[PDB]
Amino acid sequence: RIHMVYSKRSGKPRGYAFIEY
Numbered sequence: 001r002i003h004m005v006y007s008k009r010s011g012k013p014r015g016y017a018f019i020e021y
Contacts, residue, residue, distance in 0.1 A: 002018060
């Protein structure tokens with residue numbers, strides 16, 4: 001499950017919200 005394709009797994013505001021979340 002991904003949010004978009006930002007940079008990494010845990011990315012506190014942006015790269016977080018469905019990649020790690």
